């Protein structure tokens, strides 16, 4: 189990997971808050 | 098929064929069982899973299967040196073949009979596909007219 978690912590796996999480978060932000041209607060 | 051909069972000879029992619904099915064939297969899968898995584990570890509790039945799962011949208190109730030579002879009988049965099963499947009838019916029709009713004579009609 330790070796598996160590493999999941490698640079490529972590890079792909981080990019996927960031892309998913951005996609959902644009899905619920679309066409945000300016920062209207 | 033999029992139905003689009228012993209340099933017609064409309905008592093995490939029309329900194993292959497209080829025919007997819809009078106490429960549908799929649920029967579910029970079959559970039971056969238990039996086959225990047999496989005994093959891997001959000493196993007789140590863990199994409602007291594990006492007859000790097996022997050969996985194909456990013959303990249950698999060899009558204690047939007490001497090694007699056991070898009986094993030869079993192997020859099993090989003949394998060949017969394959033949039954082929005949059913090419004659659309049962093995007993095929044998009777061949006996009535052997020169006409045979493999060469049935090439014109195979799935009719």
């Amino acid at each position: 189990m330790k070796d598996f978690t160590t493999y999941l912590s490698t640079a490529p796996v972590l890079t792909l997971l981080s990019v996927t999480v960031v892309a998913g978060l951005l996609i959902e932000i644009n899905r619920f808050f679309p066409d945000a041209l300016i920062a209207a607060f | 098929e033999i029992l139905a051909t003689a009228g012993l069972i209340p099933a017609t000879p064409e309905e008592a064929v093995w490939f029309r029992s329900g194993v292959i619904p497209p080829a025919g099915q007997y819809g009078k069982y106490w429960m549908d064939p799929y649920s029967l297969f579910w029970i079959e899968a559970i039971l056969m899973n238990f039996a086959e898995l225990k047999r496989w584990q005994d093959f891997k570890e001959p000493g196993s299967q007789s140590k863990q509790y199994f409602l007291g039945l594990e006492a007859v799962f000790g097996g022997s040196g050969n996985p194909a011949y456990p013959g303990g208190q249950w698999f060899n109730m009558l204690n047939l073949g007490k001497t090694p030579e007699e056991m070898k002879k009986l094993q030869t009988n079993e192997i020859r009979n099993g090989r003949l049965a394998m060949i017969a099963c394959l033949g039954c499947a082929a005949q059913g596909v090419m004659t659309q009838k049962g093995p007993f019916a095929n044998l009777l029709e061949h006996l009535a007219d052997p020169v006409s009713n045979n493999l060469l004579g049935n090439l014109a009609t195979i799935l009719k």
């Binding site: - | 497209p26 060469l152 090439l155 014109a156 009609t157 195979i158 799935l159 009719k160």
Partner: protein, 74 residues
């Protein structure tokens, strides 16, 4: 397409398949008697393309596959 019989209804029923290809009323007897000409209805050597679909004749492709299969097996 919803009215055409299912593939098993054609694969396991020589009567319907014979209705579509009459050479099938003879079964496998012509194949074993070396009278392959009887199978000329579904084993053609036409050529060109099908004027309805614009593609090759499926019978020609069947014949082609059978010939190359025999050649490869040999």
């Amino acid at each position: 397409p919803k009215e055409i019989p299912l593939p098993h209804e054609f694969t396991l029923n020589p009567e319907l398949m014979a209705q579509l290809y009459p050479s099938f009323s003879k079964g496998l007897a012509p194949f074993f008697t070396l009278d392959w000409a009887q199978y000329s209805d579904f084993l053609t050597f036409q050529g060109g393309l099908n004027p309805v679909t614009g593609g090759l004749w499926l019978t020609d492709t069947v014949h082609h596959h059978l010939a190359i299969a025999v050649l490869f097996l040999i």
